[PDB]
Structure formats: C-alpha cells, structure tokens
Amino acid sequence: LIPTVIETRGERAYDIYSRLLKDRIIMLGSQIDDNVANSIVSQLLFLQAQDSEKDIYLYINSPGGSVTAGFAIYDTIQHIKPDVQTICIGMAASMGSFLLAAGAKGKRFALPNAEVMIHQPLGGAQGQATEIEIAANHILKTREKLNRILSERTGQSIEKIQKDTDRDNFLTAEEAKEYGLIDEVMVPE
Amino acid sequence: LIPTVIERAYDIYSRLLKDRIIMLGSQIDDNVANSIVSQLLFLQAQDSEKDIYLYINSPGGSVTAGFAIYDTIQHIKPDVQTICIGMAASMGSFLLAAGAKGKRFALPNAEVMIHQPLGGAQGQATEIEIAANHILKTREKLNRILSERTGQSIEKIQKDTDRDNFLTAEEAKEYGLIDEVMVP
Amino acid sequence: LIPTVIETTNRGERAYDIYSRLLKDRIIMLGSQIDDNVANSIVSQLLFLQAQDSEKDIYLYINSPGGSVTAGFAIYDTIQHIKPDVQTICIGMAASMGSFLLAAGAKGKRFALPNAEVMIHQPLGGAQGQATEIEIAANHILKTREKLNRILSERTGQSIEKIQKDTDRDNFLTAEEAKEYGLIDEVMVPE
Amino acid sequence: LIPTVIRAYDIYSRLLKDRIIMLGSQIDDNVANSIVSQLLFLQAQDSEKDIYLYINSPGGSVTAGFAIYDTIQHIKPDVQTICIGMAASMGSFLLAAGAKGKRFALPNAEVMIHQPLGGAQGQATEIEIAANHILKTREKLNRILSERTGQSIEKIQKDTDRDNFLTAEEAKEYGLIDEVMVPE
Amino acid sequence: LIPTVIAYDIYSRLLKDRIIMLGSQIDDNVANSIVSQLLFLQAQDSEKDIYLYINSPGGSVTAGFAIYDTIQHIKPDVQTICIGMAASMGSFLLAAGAKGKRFALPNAEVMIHQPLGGAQGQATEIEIAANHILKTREKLNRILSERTGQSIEKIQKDTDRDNFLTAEEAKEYGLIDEVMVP
Amino acid sequence: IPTVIETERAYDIYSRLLKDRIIMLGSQIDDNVANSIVSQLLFLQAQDSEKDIYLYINSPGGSVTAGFAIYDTIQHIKPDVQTICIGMAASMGSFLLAAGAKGKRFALPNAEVMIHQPLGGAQGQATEIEIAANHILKTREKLNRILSERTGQSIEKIQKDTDRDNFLTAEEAKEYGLIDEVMVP
Amino acid sequence: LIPTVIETTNRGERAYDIYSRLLKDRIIMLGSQIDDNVANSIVSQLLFLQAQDSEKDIYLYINSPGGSVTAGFAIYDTIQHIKPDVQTICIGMAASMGSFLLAAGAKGKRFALPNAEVMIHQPLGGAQGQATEIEIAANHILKTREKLNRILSERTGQSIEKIQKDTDRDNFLTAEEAKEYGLIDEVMVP
Amino acid sequence: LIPTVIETTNRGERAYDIYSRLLKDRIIMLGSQIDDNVANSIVSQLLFLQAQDSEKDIYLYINSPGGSVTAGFAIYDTIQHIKPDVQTICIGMAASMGSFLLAAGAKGKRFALPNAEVMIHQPLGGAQGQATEIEIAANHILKTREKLNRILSERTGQSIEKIQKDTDRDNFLTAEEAKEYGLIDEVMVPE
Amino acid sequence: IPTVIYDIYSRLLKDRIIMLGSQIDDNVANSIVSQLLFLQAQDSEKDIYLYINSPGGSVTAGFAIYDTIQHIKPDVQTICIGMAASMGSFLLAAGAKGKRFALPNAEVMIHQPLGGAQGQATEIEIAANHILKTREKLNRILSERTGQSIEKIQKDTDRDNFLTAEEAKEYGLIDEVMVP
C-alpha cells in the first residue's frame, strides 16, 4: 500500500508521493525505464510551470537502468529554469549516480550512509558481424557521451573517469563528494 | 504510481493534456495509437488554432499504429510540434519527423535511430512472397514520406536505413529529421 | 483487503485505510521485507511527519525479516536526519536490517514486546564473473559489514570485535536478551 | 467481491466499527500487521470496551502470531476470542490467548494443536543453530499454552507431538476455551 | 463484471434486503464473508427472515461449518434456496436452513457424497488423517440425519459414492422442504 | 562399470563378483532391483545349494513389497545368505540386513543403519483413506513382527524405536540384534 | 567416448577400455562426485583386487569434489578392511569426502601432485518438518561430523579441537599445505 | 557416429574407433570442454602411454574452449610428472585452460596450425552467502589466478605483471602472435 | 546406420571417403581431423574425398578441418552434394585446386559470420573486434581460394547469398559441376 495523508479552504486527500510533489519533491526510487522517465519529465515540467524560480528536490534511490531514459530526465533537468537539487538516499548506481551528478551546482547531496556506484554501460548484441559492429560503436559512443558530461560535472579528466568506471566502483557519500559527484554530505539536523 | 496534481484533481498526464501536451512515452501498439489519436481529435475540438505538443520517448513499434497517429496529425488543423526526449527509434523517429514544419525538436542528448521495418512470415512460398511484397511496399511508403519530410532523396534514405543508424540530436537536425535542437 | 476506518469531521466524514489512520497519529508500520519501495514509502512518511510537527515523537513499528542493506540505510539516514525522535517498537520479529533499524531508534526509546524475536547475523550477497569482479564484490560486502558493525557498536555499546563474533552466524535473541545486549532500551510490559 | 453496507462500509470495516476483528486467513506478517493495527485503533477509540477477535485460521508464522499475541496482552481492553470453523497452529494459540472467561467456540468448530514446523539447510553448524531455534520456539509456545490452559508443559509436549484434532467441547475441557457458545 | 444499481453494487443491493449469495466454491474467504453478512443482518433486525442463495459445488468442510454454526446461532430464520446446484458442503448448508424454509428451484441439482481428503508421510500420520476424516464424516452424517429425518445408516449408504438428486428427489429425501414453483 | 578379464572370459565387475556368489544391493529398492536380486539368488542356489551367498547392502531402501520379494527368496533357498552392510542400510535396506542367515549378518565399523516406520500416501474419499491407512498399518505390524523375530527385540520396543527416524552405528546395530558382528580389519 | 586400448597377449589379443586397462594394474579411478553407484563400483574394485593379490599395493586416484558421507564411508571401510595397502593420489582436487578418502590412504603412501587442490569443510545437509524431526536431523549431522573429525584427528595427528576450527568454513589447501597438515605424506615430484 | 577403422594384424583383424586408433600411435585428443571426466580420460591415457613407452613422445591435440581449472591442473600435473615429452598442437582453438595446457607442452614442442586461435583471460567463478563466505571464495579464485599466472610466466618467459595485464579481459591471439608471446614455440607449416 | 559385410560410413572411409554431413561443431571437427590424419598415414600419395552436405557451424571448428586439409600431403577433393553454407562452403572452397566439385542441384551459400556479445561496453568492443578480425581472416582466404577480391567477397557476403552449382563454379568456389 501507499499511505494516504489528509490536510485540513477544504479537506484534500493525497497519496504520500503526490503530497511531496506538491512541495516540489520528485521521488526517483526505482529502476530507470521509459515509464519512470516519462513520469519524472512530466513532474519536472509541471513544477516549472507552477513556479520557475523555486528549487526542485529530486530524491534518488535507484540502481539505474536505461541510458536514454536517464537522459530524458537529464535533459529536462538542464532545460527547465529552476535549480534541481539532487539527494542520494540509500544508493545511486549507473544512471542513478549520473543523475545525482547532474543536479544544480552546489545542490547535489547525499546522506552519510548513502552509497554511490559508477561503472561502464551494459548492453548486448547478436547477429551478423556487421550488426555486432554497429552495436559496439553505439555503446562506445554512449560511454564517451556519459564520461564527457561526468568530466564537466565532476572536474575530473575524461582519462580518469574512463579508468575509474572500467569496473564497478563503489563510493561512500564522502568519497562521492571528493570525487565531485556531489557537493555536500547532508549532516543531521 | 502516477502522481496526482491538485489545482480539480488530475493525474499528471491528464494535467499536461489540459495544456495540449500529449505524451508518446512507450512502445507504439494499437492501444497507444488509439489513445494518441483520441487526444489529438479532442484537442482539435477544444481549439483548432492553438499548437499541440507531442513528446516522443519511444523505441517505435507497429507501422500501421504509427500511421494512425501520422494521418491524424496531418489531418487536424492545429500544428502538432514534436519534441524528442530520450530517444525516438523506428516509427518513433518517423512521427518525430512528421511534426509541423519548423516545430520539430530534440533536446541535446536525445537519440534518434532510423532503420528498415521488421517483420516475419512462415508457410508456403506464395505466402512468403505476399509478405515480402507487403513489407517491401511498406518500406517504400515510409521512405517516400521521410524523403518529403527531411528533404533527402529516396536513394539516400534507402542506404541510410539499411541497417540500424543511430543519430545525435545535432545529426538529426542536419539530416532534416528535426528543425532545431532545444537549448537551455 | 485492508480495513477502512471512518471518523466524524465537522466538514463531513473522512475515511482512512487503517495504516493511513495510524500515520495521522505519527505511527509508521514497517511490517514487510525491506526493499527500495518500502524504504521510499517510509522515508516519505518520516519527512512528512517532520513537516507536520518537528517536535512530537514518531513511532516506527518493526515486524520485518529485513532485506536490502542500502534500502535500510535510506530509512536509517532519514531517521537520524529529522528533528523528531523516532521510537522503535519490535513486535513479532526483527531480523537482518530489521534489527539494525530497531537499534537505530532514539536513545532511550527503543522497545520490544516480551515475546518479540530479534536476530542478528552478517550480510548476505553474491558475485559471479572474473576473479577481479569477485574481488570487487567481496571487498564491497566486507566494507558494508564493517559499516553496519561500526554503527551497531556505537548504538549498543558493545565492541566491534564482539559484534563480529556475535554476527558471524545467525544469532536469535529474546526481547530481554536484546535489552542486555543494547539493541533496545526496554521490554514493554502490559498495561 | 466483498459486499458493501450503507457512511458506506465494506462488511469487514462495518464489523470493525463495532470492535469486531476478523482473523479468517493464514497468519503471515501482513495479516499480523493489519490485526495489530486494528487492536491499537480500537483501544484508542475506547480502552474500556471489549474487542471481539473472530478466528477461522489454519495458523501460520509463529513470529507473526506473537505480534498479535503480544498486542492482545498489551492493550487495556479484554479481547474475546471466538473460534468459528477451525483454529489450527498459531490460530488455536491465539484462541487460547483471549481474555480469561471470554474464550469461545461454536459447537462444530474444530481446534487443532501440533508442534511448530520449519526447515534448515547448509552446514551442520547452521542446522544446529536452526534446530536450537525451533526448539526454543516450541518451548516458548508450550510454556504460554501451559499458563493459559492449566495443563502441564509435559502434557502439551506429548499432545502436540503429532496433529491433535479437538472438538469444541474437547477444547473447553483442555482449557483452550472457556465456553462453547450455544444458540440464541 | 458486477453491475451497479441506483448507488449499490447488485450484490450489496440484495444484501440490504437480507439476501446473501453463496455462489462459489466454499473456502475460508467465502465463509468469513457470509458469516460477517449473517452477523450484520442479525444486528440490523433479529426478527426478520434471511435468504441464503446457494449455487455452490461446496469445498472446505470446516469453512462450511463456520457458516452452519453461524446460521444456527443467530436469532433470525435463515431460508435456503438452491439455484443451479448444491454439492458437498453446499447441499449440507441447504439442509441447514430454517425448518420448513429450505427450497430448491425445479431444475436445481443437489449432490451428496462422502468428504474428500489426502494424507502422506509415516503410517502413524496416515492413521491420524484417516481417523480425522472418518470422524468428520460421522459428524456430517449425524447432522444430516437430524436435518433430513433419515437414519445415519442410510445417509452413509447414500453418500458412499456420488449421489445426484433432482429437486423433487431432494424434497422426499428431507434435504429441502419445498420445490419453489413459478 | 569396469571390465575384468580372467585366464579368457571377460566380465563386468558385478558379474565377476556374482560368479563368486556375491550379490550387490547398492541402490534404491524397486521392483526392477528386486527381480534382479531374486534371479541372482535363484541361480546361485541352482549352481550350488550348499555354499554361502554374500549379499552386500548399501541402500536407502525403497518399496516394501519389492523388499519382501528379496526377503522371501532369501528365506526360501537352501544356502545361507550372509548380509554385509557397507556405507548405509535404511528402510527395507536394514530390514534385509537383519534377514541374513543367523550368525552371518555383518556391518563394517563406520556403516550406518537406520530404522523407521513405513511411508505411504492416500487421497480420495474417507473410505479410501481408511483402506489405505489400515493397509500401511498392517504392513507395519508385519514388518515389526519379523524384525522382532530376527533381532530378539519385542514388537513393543520395535514400535517405539521405529516411530521416528533412528540412526544407529554398526556397534549399536549389533547390540540391537540387526547384525551379529562388526567386521574388523 | 572412452578410448579403447589393445594389447598382444600370449593367448591372443585383449581389448580394454582405458579405465579397465588401468584396473588390471591395480589402479582405481575416483574421478567424479561420490554417490552410491560410485561407492559400489570402487568397493567392488577393491574387493576384486584383493582377491587377485592380497600383498600388492592398490593405487586410488582421487579427483573428486566429494559427495555422500555414507557412500564415502563405504569406500573408507573397504580400504581399511582389505589386506593390501591402498595408496591415495590426489590429482586436480579432493574436496569434502574426497579429501577424507585421500587422508585414509595407507600411511606413508598418501600423495598429491604439486598443483592439486585439497579442501576440507563441515558436512552439508538439510531438514524440513516438525521441530522434533529438525532435532533428529541436527543430531544426526552433528554426530556424523564428530565421526569424520575424530578419524581425521587419528589420520592427520591434529587435535579434534583444531580439526573443528579448520573445517568450520571452506578451507582450501595447497598440496604442500596438505602435507604439513597431515592429510598426505608426500608431494609427488616430476 | 564415430567411424571405425580395421587393420590387418597377425592375430586376425583388429577394429578400432578412430580416436583409439590414434591413441595407439600415442596421440591424445583434447577436443571438448575440460570437465572432470575429460581430465580423468586424458590422465589415464597419459599414464597408459608412459607405461607402454617411457621414452617416445606423446602428442596432445588441443581444440578446446577450456573449462574447469582443477580439471585442467590434473592434466597439467600428469603431463609434467611422466617421463615422456608431451607435444602440444593447437588446431581450431585453445581458450582458458585449453591455452594453459597448450603452453604446458614440452619445451620446443608446442605448436599451432596457422589459422588456429589462442585466447587467454582470467578465471571465472561464483560465490553467494555470507560476507565471510564471499571472502573465502574471492581469496580462493584470486590465489587460483596467481597460480595460473606464475606458471604461464615460467612457461612463456613473460613477467607476472604482463600476464596479469594481458589476461585482464579476453585476449585473442593468432598462431603467430601466440608464438611471439611464448605460448607456443612454432607454427606448423604445410607439408 | 546400415551394415555392410563395417557400418556404411566406415566402409566409405576405407576407400578414403570422409562424410561431412552435419552441422560443424568441435566433435565433428575432431572426427574429421582424425580421419584425415589416419588416411594420410595409410597412404600419403592417394587422393582423399570429402563429401560436404553441411549448413556449417563453428568457425574455429571449421578452421581445425581447414588447417588439417592443407597440412597433409594428400589432395583432398571436395564434393558438395545437397548444400554447403557458412563454413560448409568455406571448406568446399578449401579443397585441392582443380578437384572441388558440386552436383548440379547442390546449393552453395556464403554470408558473414554470426555471433553475440553481452556485458560492459569494453567487452562488446573486444567481441566486435574479434568477430570482425575473424571475418577479415575468412575473406582473405576465400580471396586466395576463389580468385575474387577481398572487397568483392565483403559485399557478396554482407547478406545471405545463395548460389547454384554453376554460379559457384564461375565464382571460383568450385572448379567443376559433376555431370552424370
């Protein structure tokens, strides 16, 4: 079940996630596919139309998923006028950590015991040599694209990103900070 | 869960629809086509002058379902803008190029893919032949419209669609599949 | 079918699902395996209750065999972050990250009912592929265990050495044993 | 379909309004959490008035059962227990857990007591740990059944070694219930 | 699936007029629902008759007994009307209706037979299960006897194997009082 | 299955052991295994009705009736049939171990012997459950009686001791009466 | 396909599958998981070889992940019972009952080749059903473990206390390490 | 169907399956995945051939994608143990322990035909369960790799540093490349 | 498989005829390599006949056969009956020069190597480079064997390409169509 919350100009009933969206909080708390991406793009656009000045809060607890779906979110984040803060809670892996890195400069956060993981894109291809070749070049170009943006966003060289993403690379919040994937570890109120 | 938004209480997609935004965010099958057709028809009825926005994040799908949307786009009075976000492949990229002239867009990192139609046939040689001609005709039809819509020659479309062909947003622009890359 | 509860408001009759009714009184139910979905729900509930009232206590009921470590830490960090004290009440059982969260309640406000069961053990996982890949997975789950153990030490007052011996294999505790161990503060006795 | 009654209530919610709780399935963590919540709510509404727990259950998880058990014993209100159809496993344990003098079964209700079930695979050391666990669990169950029924731990142990089917009248004689509810 | 009538679902609408529908296999869910319905109607009015529709192949013996005992316990007469079929615990409950108020419609089918079960494991466990089902059968057979007027000996002969009855046959047997006529 | 050559007739290892009056019961006991062993016994008798036969037993048991096929044949033939438990003998496995010729029933030191009650199943009508229950109960009395006769233990004790799985060392099996002797190096 | 091998005897030609050929020279191949079938075959082979010649050594090759404990003891007991010395030679790996049988070879005639892998751990098993049945199974596998550990103590010279610590979890040993442990006497060199 | 071959001897006609016919001339075929059965078969052949003739060379044809490391080492250790030189000849491919065994042939007598393919990579494995179990599995496969790499170093003349870099991911070599790597001594050129 | 007073395939093998009449896997390669080596030892002068009715299969398996054909002294004639596809038609082309044949209605098919790769980008890359190198290798040899250019082979094998026996002759895959 998703719990319901009720506020008391009338009495309005909200599912907990909708209630958070009313305070400009978007939950990316699952594997990233086209459906999750559509929902989050819609939310971003709606929040912008309501107010193009106020910050947005993107909660990321996600193992990642589709690169293109992740980029649908990424590009929408960069297009809209409001700063989109990113907050890692639990883990951010794959495009999950890419999106965390994509938050507004100075406003990328993770809570202390959150886990950040970076690695190289995964894919698959079968058929003729020529089809294998196309699929190879495609995922290689996609990786260059990902790594270039990470370099811009973290301050690390493409050479270093390439090394450090060659195999699964698990980072503490703190380590994610010094790497430049986030700006700040959120310390207890 | 699809979030709710209270202004009247709307699911987020229906709230976008009230502002003439249609989301093509899935595989194109008959159901998606009937939904999108129904939304286009409805928005025209509400206002035949104002632009409509068709978001495209789709790996494509059924060609006939794609043409259901294409024909409905072209038939109605309003300009239907097309915005590629994430990717448009197969009939997805077809519908992207079918947007109103000067109002086809993609955000910078969106991916566009063009390739030939896919199908299958089993049974007697005569049935194979019928299915072969059918999908060969369908390709000519698709290529002909892409030619008209992109400004490229049928000759060039045939070569470039022979195998999977992945394009960047900027590349889709110089190809003629979109008009403009939407910048921040 | 989750039962419905209806109250009489002056602006009509408001109807709640039973869990939602409890959440109005600042009670959160962790009554399932901990996966990312359950974590997102509980994080959301915690953040909402803080917005409603930054000073009143929150009650987290725990009947959970545990689950994802990271999902658990989502909840853990949210608990530690917010202003309100979060009480923890173990009812039924609390194993794996369940017993971790139980121990993570506000100091002095971690409870178990007399017949509730607490279990502590080491984290479980897997790895396949090249030796280098196995090595990365091994280091990962070993670090995760160090992390868990270091916090349990701070939370229970037991040494890290002792936590590691005692979690090496499945370790079932009674409520009263959970108390002397330092995982909870008090065994709630009947009213 | 669960029927509705007209404040429009599903039947079980309607019964809940009169402090009646239905345990009418296998006991798992979900069923436990639902019943715990109902108990906590009814107490909040009125800490003085009796609650009625209807039991038609083959039983299930022991820990889940003890979630319910501890909650019944913690709250101020007397929880009556009423076995209708059957109580087995933790089902009949909870039947015995009702308020003294307010444990009932209808004339043809069946009550079954037996030892806990479980499993264990792996190293000998792990089997050992699992075996000590289910044995301690059994000790715990039998000690509380002894407190509740007036029978000895020794007798519970022997009488639960294998499946033990009881009539309502036998269950009364055993101390599992206080009374057989005769017709009005 | 379920039509609406004005608002009520069709089954809820019938429930307002003290009609309960047993139209499925009898399991613990169906029994809880029916028991809840019976309890609720009683509270609303302890005097007025209740109508229990039966179109069921039967199912769990214990679940059936949950319904049966609830029927006998409440103040109101519970009428039973067999429509379509009543088998196993289905036909048992038909017979458990208020005396003089047990009905079937002319083409309704009633079937009686001995309870079904299973057992595997040690000989000792097969023995426990066998004694359990045999005792369950005597219980049912004893109650059918009381309800029909037939001797326990005859109930046991007639239930030894599947025994299908017409509504008119069900009447002379004692399972119902009356065939409802147009 | 290895082959051995004697000086030149070539045997599979098991057929060579059968030439020397050794029968191998080294699997679950089903009708096939019973018929094979019945046939090996009947033949070895015909060859020489005086000489001992050796029945190796490493078996978890299996079908009761199949087990009795072997038992009744062992008892029927003139020769003494020694039994040797190697590894384990459970269910009808240990029943056949006990059924060897008196004084000639053995287990090696680390062999394991398990006794327990028969297993079965029944579904359908009450009356059919009843028939299946009586059937397995009788089968158990019959087994127990014969164990009593062979072990020297009472039927009462056999029934208590077989009520659940009961694992015995070779030495325990000797003092139970299931075997006469533990074979030593 | 198992290769065939043909020799010229005095009394004609004799054709053997390779494993049967090796058996003629008193070599037994334990090269698989240990179940009842494998146990019955090896026991039969041991019995036959002793009947052929009670004095001459037998060679047991061990490349096995182990398997059934009882099937293992079938082999073990047969080895100890027959007059001839059974040499044990670990090639590839010996784990679980495999390494138990390796240690069970004739004293001073337990070998491994240099890159062979030996692994010792505790027995594995399973039980479901009533508390009472879980108890029985538990006792059964704990007794089995004592049994195995006691014999390993005798065979290696290590204390029972040490055997139990060192078998608590999977414990991989090099051939050289198996020698210092006392599971083998010698590492066979080229 | 494996074909049969029949020769004329002085004790009548002897009939061989083709593989057995090759074994008579001291040719062993490793032409499948390496599992325990294959290793036992090949070990037995090696031992048999040594007994027949402790002096004459043996020929080990290798067309194998590899397989079990321990199975591979059974063969490897048997090769080094017996008196006779074992020549290795790669035909088709050698990958994994297949290429390890290729390298393991007698010095100066390791060969591949011109279009044969040699692949080297790191060992593959799996682990599940408690952190402590994963760690044991990790150390095991890491040690296994060190063992493989150290022997390859001896056998090829390359350093351990290089063997590790070059085996990090799948590394396909031509016959000629295999020769300059030191995995083989010679490419067999047509007669 | 019928017997002859030898099984039929073994009977043919006595007369130096090898049958490649199935998919090519490592087993089939090992068998055919063994038969070739045997036949050479019996007589290093006399021709061998390789019957090909195969849809092909593993490339490395096929190269096992290919290399063994080229290594031994005897001319290996190739005779395509039924069909030859993938490495089937590669081996047909690998026969001794002047002694590669097909019966009139036999079918010959040439196409590019098939394969697969999943995992990290870097792994897809290695697999891609591998199958691409493998295709370069096949094409270079086909070129040497047919007289056709590498560039022509490349385009001609881009998709499935069916040839008649006659077309296979003028392509250079065989030397002659065997007539009644």
Ligand SMILES: CC[C@H](C)CNC(=O)N1CCC(=O)N2[C@@H]([C@@H](C)CC)C(=O)N(Cc3cccc4ccccc34)C[C@H]12
């Ligand atoms: C709840 C009210 C509603 C969201 C406000 N309306 C609105 O945002 N609109 C309509 C009017 C309009 O001119 N625009 C424009 C711009 C104002 C977008 C900021 C537009 O291009 N789109 C296309 C579009 C479509 C879909 C996704 C998208 C993502 C990212 C860039 C565009 C996208 C929709 C946009």
Ligand SMILES: CC[C@H](C)CNC(=O)N1CCC(=O)N2[C@@H]([C@@H](C)CC)C(=O)N(Cc3cccc4ccccc34)C[C@H]12
């Ligand atoms: C919410 C109000 C409503 C949408 C306004 N009504 C309307 O647009 N109508 C009814 C009256 C009418 O005359 N027409 C006509 C035209 C006005 C179409 C714009 C019509 O052909 N159709 C058929 C139709 C059917 C289905 C899909 C379609 C797609 C594309 C062309 C037609 C299509 C429906 C159309």
Ligand SMILES: CC[C@H](C)CNC(=O)N1CCC(=O)N2[C@@H]([C@@H](C)CC)C(=O)N(Cc3cccc4ccccc34)C[C@H]12
């Ligand atoms: C019912 C209304 C609403 C819940 C009150 N508003 C609110 O809690 N907000 C918005 C305004 C705001 O400034 N913040 C801030 C702080 C006030 C967090 C307490 C913020 O960082 N987040 C990010 C976030 C996002 C998601 C989960 C989270 C968990 C734990 C720390 C943060 C988290 C959201 C936070």
Ligand SMILES: CC[C@H](C)CNC(=O)N1CCC(=O)N2[C@@H]([C@@H](C)CC)C(=O)N(Cc3cccc4ccccc34)C[C@H]12
């Ligand atoms: C419909 C209104 C609402 C239910 C009344 N409020 C209430 O019951 N509350 C909040 C305020 C409060 O002080 N308490 C306290 C006590 C009053 C519990 C009766 C509390 O410990 N809990 C924790 C809890 C949590 C979960 C399960 C439970 C089971 C059994 C003992 C406790 C449990 C929640 C409790």
Ligand SMILES: CC[C@H](C)CNC(=O)N1CCC(=O)N2[C@@H]([C@@H](C)CC)C(=O)N(Cc3cccc4ccccc34)C[C@H]12
């Ligand atoms: C819609 C209002 C509500 C139904 C009226 N209240 C009511 O029936 N109640 C509460 C108060 C009360 O004293 N009783 C009593 C009696 C009045 C039962 C008629 C009671 O025993 N139960 C237990 C019960 C519990 C569950 C199933 C049941 C079956 C069959 C006999 C009992 C059963 C519940 C009963």
Ligand SMILES: CC[C@H](C)CNC(=O)N1CCC(=O)N2[C@@H]([C@@H](C)CC)C(=O)N(Cc3cccc4ccccc34)C[C@H]12
């Ligand atoms: C190697 C030669 C051959 C086995 C010797 N012949 C022989 O034993 N025969 C035939 C002639 C004969 O008179 N008999 C007789 C008796 C001599 C049995 C000892 C016989 O009853 N049977 C039936 C039989 C049939 C099957 C199984 C059996 C088990 C156990 C008792 C009998 C059984 C077969 C028996």
Ligand SMILES: CC[C@H](C)CNC(=O)N1CCC(=O)N2[C@@H]([C@@H](C)CC)C(=O)N(Cc3cccc4ccccc34)C[C@H]12
């Ligand atoms: C190739 C011919 C043949 C093997 C030589 N004969 C022979 O070994 N025999 C028969 C005669 C005999 O007196 N014995 C005796 C002893 C000589 C056993 C060494 C015996 O007890 N058995 C039983 C037996 C049965 C099965 C397995 C066994 C394992 C281990 C101890 C015994 C075992 C068989 C033994």
Ligand SMILES: CC[C@H](C)CNC(=O)N1CCC(=O)N2[C@@H]([C@@H](C)CC)C(=O)N(Cc3cccc4ccccc34)C[C@H]12
């Ligand atoms: C066809 C005739 C027959 C093969 C010649 N006999 C023979 O090779 N024998 C027996 C006599 C003997 O003393 N030895 C010795 C040596 C002569 C081994 C070369 C021995 O240790 N083994 C053990 C063994 C067992 C299994 C595999 C093996 C691998 C590799 C090293 C040993 C191995 C067997 C060896």
Ligand SMILES: CC[C@H](C)CNC(=O)N1CCC(=O)N2[C@@H]([C@@H](C)CC)C(=O)N(Cc3cccc4ccccc34)C[C@H]12
């Ligand atoms: C039944 C009679 C037997 C076939 C004649 N003996 C023979 O051909 N031998 C042994 C003696 C010998 O010097 N050689 C040599 C050459 C004579 C191979 C022609 C050799 O390299 N091999 C390795 C080998 C192994 C496997 C496949 C192969 C393919 C193709 C090149 C080699 C290959 C085996 C070869």
Ligand SMILES: [Mg+2]
């Ligand atoms: Mg922005």
Ligand SMILES: [Mg+2]
């Ligand atoms: Mg238009």
Ligand SMILES: [Mg+2]
């Ligand atoms: Mg706090």
Ligand SMILES: [Mg+2]
């Ligand atoms: Mg109470």
Ligand SMILES: [Mg+2]
């Ligand atoms: Mg009544």
Ligand SMILES: [Mg+2]
């Ligand atoms: Mg006899």
Ligand SMILES: [Mg+2]
């Ligand atoms: Mg000995």
